[PDB]
């Protein structure tokens, strides 16, 4: 089973995770082997059956995924009323603030391998039929071996192809800011920013600007320029991730075969 019985874990830190979350870190005790170190959501008392019912569908997903690039479901603990989310640790944590606390210690082909990684979780991903909605280097982990995995699949939902909600502005798409129409064309979108915050190693978005500048001047058609050291296929790759119309950006497929082919022959 993947249920855990709440004596196997050892919890060393607890965070909150906006309102109603918190995420922990610590270790799981797995019979016959070393303990696991692991990371840990959980819903904090005094939950709605909404809230516990979005969580477990969130979990179920997630248990679902098998690939390099997807974080790993170690299991849940969904027992006496308790709801938490047990997954693989990542020594490394989030992208955009390990970037960030390394700024410069990585070669370009390094950081494209980091990308080509997202790249791979996100078609895994669109392929099965899911939009994730919330892709941003924060939403990213990095393990030991510099492996980069999707993670937070909170917001993710199955397509029919868009999907609407009854937002993080500087990641989002403009149709899924202005008419929350999500699709995977407005994931590729994310993952252009994406691309942007890793070349420029954890740099905020639209740094210069405020969230309604951001907006208009999007609309307008303003997009994100080269960070310092990106070669032009780089930036080229981001822009057509950034059409205007989403019918005309690249799917995951497309972005995966174009990153893994300036790894074979880098320019």
Same mark, same amino acid.
């Given at each position: 089973?993947?249920?855990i019985?709440?004596?196997r874990?050892?919890i060393?830190?607890?965070?909150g995770?906006?309102? %109603?979350?918190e995420?922990?870190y610590g270790?799981?005790?797995?019979?016959?082997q070393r303990?696991?170190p692991?990371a840990?959501k959980?819903?904090?008392?005094?939950?709605?059956?909404r809230?516990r019912?979005?969580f477990?569908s969130?979990?179920?997903?997630?248990?679902?995924?098998?690939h390099?690039?997807?974080?790993?479901?170690?299991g849940?603990?969904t027992?006496?009323?308790?709801?938490?989310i047990?997954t693989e640790?990542?020594?490394?944590?989030?992208?955009?603030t390990?970037?960030?606390?390394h700024?410069?210690?990585?070669?370009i082909?390094q950081?494209?391998?980091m990308?080509?990684?997202?790249?791979?979780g996100?078609?895994?991903?669109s392929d099965?039929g899911?939009?994730?909605?919330?892709?941003?280097a924060?939403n990213?982990?990095?393990? %030991?071996?510099l492996?980069?995995?999707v993670?937070?699949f909170?917001?993710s939902?199955v397509?029919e192809a868009?999907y609407?909600?009854?937002i993080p502005? !500087?990641?989002?798409?403009?149709?899924?800011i202005?008419f929350?129409?999500?699709?995977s064309?407005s994931?590729v979108?994310?993952?252009?920013?994406?691309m942007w915050?890793?070349?420029?190693?954890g740099?905020?978005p639209?740094?210069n600007?405020?969230?309604r500048?951001?907006?208009?001047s999007v609309?307008?058609?303003?997009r994100?320029?080269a960070?310092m050291?990106?070669?032009?296929?780089?930036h080229?790759?981001?822009?057509?991730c950034w059409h205007?119309? !989403?019918?005309q950006?690249?799917?995951?497929?497309?972005?995966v %075969?174009?990153?893994?082919?300036?790894i074979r022959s880098?320019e």
């Open positions: 089973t993947r249920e019985e709440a004596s874990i050892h060393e830190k607890i965070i995770s906006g309102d %109603s979350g995420v922990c270790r799981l005790r797995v019979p016959g303990d696991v692991v840990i959980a819903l904090k008392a005094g939950y709605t059956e809230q019912r979005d477990l969130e979990a179920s997903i997630m248990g679902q995924f098998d390099p690039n997807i974080i790993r479901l170690e849940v603990v027992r006496g009323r308790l709801a938490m047990v640790y990542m020594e490394n944590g989030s992208l955009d390990f970037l960030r606390t700024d410069g210690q990585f070669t082909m950081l494209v391998g990308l080509r990684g997202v790249g791979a996100m078609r895994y991903l099965l899911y939009v994730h909605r919330d892709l941003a924060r990213v982990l990095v393990d %030991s071996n492996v980069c995995k993670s937070d909170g917001l939902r397509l868009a609407t909600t009854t502005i !500087r990641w989002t798409a403009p149709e899924a202005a929350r129409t999500f699709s064309a994931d979108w994310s993952f252009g920013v994406v915050e890793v070349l420029a190693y740099e905020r639209y740094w600007m405020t969230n500048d951001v907006i208009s609309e307008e058609g303003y994100l320029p960070p050291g990106c070669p032009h296929a780089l080229q790759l981001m822009l057509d205007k119309d !989403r019918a950006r690249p799917r995951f497929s497309q972005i %075969s174009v990153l893994d082919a300036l880098p």
